Ligand binder design. Structure first.
Ligand SMILES: *[C@@]12=NC3=[C]C([C])=C([C])[C]=C3N([C][C]([O])[C]([O])[C]([O])[C]OP([O])([O])=O)C1=NC(=O)[N]C2=O
Length: 116
């Protein structure tokens, strides 16, 4: 199963990605050494809806599941639609340890419906 996913560690500064799957690398055109330690926002760009980024911010603050459709950018500047499901994962004692993200490439909901 081709699974594009990244993991972030929130107990380190600015929630850096600590692991990215090969499907995520092949999708974003970045090398594995070019993503680790960075916040995922670098995929964002001029066309990224800031109102959607704000929702991701609230979901991380409140540590709950969210699903959003975003526009991200590859290393070479290409423009794709990212269907992204964010989800917390906690240790045995109920403390947040990581965030996992699951990506998907394609224009699922048409943009005129997403703008309303
Ligand atoms: C990004 N994937 C992604 C994966 C995880 C596990 C997490 C926690 C976040 C993301 N983001 C969002 C980014 O890291 C950040 O949380 C948001 O931009 C909001 O933060 P700020 O402080 O800037 O408002 C992802 N963002 C993307 O654009 N693409 C992903 O694949």
């Amino acid at each position: 199963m081709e699974k594009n996913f990244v993991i972030s560690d929130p107990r380190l500064p600015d929630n850096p990605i600590i692991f990215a799957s090969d499907s995520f690398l092949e999708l974003t055109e970045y090398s594995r050494e070019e993503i680790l330690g960075r916040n995922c926002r670098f995929l964002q760009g001029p066309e990224t809806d800031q109102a959607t980024v704000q929702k991701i911010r609230d979901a991380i603050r409140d540590q709950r599941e969210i699903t959003v459709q975003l526009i991200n950018y590859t290393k070479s500047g290409k423009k794709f639609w990212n269907l992204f499901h964010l989800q917390p994962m906690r240790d045995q004692k109920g403390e947040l340890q990581y965030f996992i993200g699951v990506q998907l490439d394609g224009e699922f909901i048409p943009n005129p419906l997403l703008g309303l």
